[PDB]
């Protein structure tokens, strides 16, 4: 699917003739399933049928369920996306710590390099030079924590020294919202690959289902940081709409200009292929 459908209004959803049926007292509209990529329910008054959920699982469409506050609550995870998952589990169990730490280190280097590119586009020479120094100083096992220092200096330089990631302000709320959406898309891509999402490539002690999808989604955070930095003065609703405009906007991949969903799918495919082939090629994404 190419289309992200967001339903914030109360209505009933059915599945008829390979077609999503939106039925509401004011009007009814039918949208084909093949064109639909992501389905987002932003309200608790929406009704759906289990048959349409089964058709969405067969169509491999990500379904997101939000709360009354409109923040995402729980997303649907299919058990078997493809038959290659059961064969990929043995490869994930056969993975090596050198390949995991190497791919994760290269991914963190791509994220820090993207932050230095964002500060370079923002015309900060000292900040991007320091973040570039931390990128050149990144090492295996991360003994210096140059990634966390790059994040602290990045947010502290962008939003001011008094700003922090632990604050309850709408800036951190929008950051966690964009990280939740990108984490949902990357997690759905990991479900398409079939590998276990709970197994991370960095720390084996930390146990989280979103760890792998976060490690894959680390390089794309600065794209959310840019719109969050531009819309920071706007209200949280307009910032959420601008965050929704990221799906409509296109970004330039090394090969050509593509949509965000295609870049995430191809990037995750190259990451899984690189993990199974033990680092044949590392995909690099630049702003």
């Amino acid at each position: 699917g190419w289309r992200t459908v967001v339903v914030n209004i109360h209505s009933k959803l059915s599945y008829k003739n390979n077609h999503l049926i939106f039925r509401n007292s004011y009007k009814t509209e039918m949208i084909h399933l093949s064109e639909i990529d992501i389905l987002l329910l932003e309200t608790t008054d929406i009704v759906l049928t289990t048959m349409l959920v089964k058709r969405l699982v067969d169509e491999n469409i990500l379904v997101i369920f939000c709360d009354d506050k409109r923040l995402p609550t729980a997303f649907l995870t299919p058990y078997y996306a493809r038959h290659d998952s059961s064969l990929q589990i043995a490869r994930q169990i056969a993975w090596k710590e050198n390949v995991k730490c190497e791919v994760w280190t290269a991914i963190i280097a791509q994220k820090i390099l993207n932050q230095s590119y964002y500060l370079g586009e923002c015309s900060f020479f000292e900040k991007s030079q320091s973040i570039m120094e931390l990128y050149h100083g990144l090492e295996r096992f991360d003994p210096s924590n140059r990634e966390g220092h790059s994040a602290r200096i990045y947010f502290n330089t962008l939003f001011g020294n008094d700003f922090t990631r632990e604050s309850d302000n709408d800036i951190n709320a929008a950051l966690d919202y964009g990280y939740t959406l990108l984490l949902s898309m990357f997690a759905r891509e990991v479900v398409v690959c079939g590998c276990m999402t709970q197994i991370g490539l960095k720390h084996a002690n930390q146990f989280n289902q979103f760890n792998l999808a976060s490690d894959i989604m680390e390089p794309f955070r600065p794209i959310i940081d840019r719109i969050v930095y531009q819309n920071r003065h706007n209200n949280f609703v307009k910032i959420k709409k601008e965050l929704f405009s990221i799906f409509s906007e296109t970004y330039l991949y090394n090969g050509k200009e593509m949509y965000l969903s295609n870049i995430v799918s191809d990037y995750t495919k190259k990451v899984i292929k690189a993990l199974n082939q033990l680092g044949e090629e590392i995909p690099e994404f630049r702003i």
Binding site: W2, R3, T4, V5, V6, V7, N8, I9, S11, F22, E29, I31, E42, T43, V237, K238, K241, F244, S245, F247, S248, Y259
Partner: peptide, 11 residues
Amino acid sequence: EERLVFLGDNY
């Protein structure tokens, strides 16, 4: 041909 389809308030 719209990428983001919104059924609800148009914000």
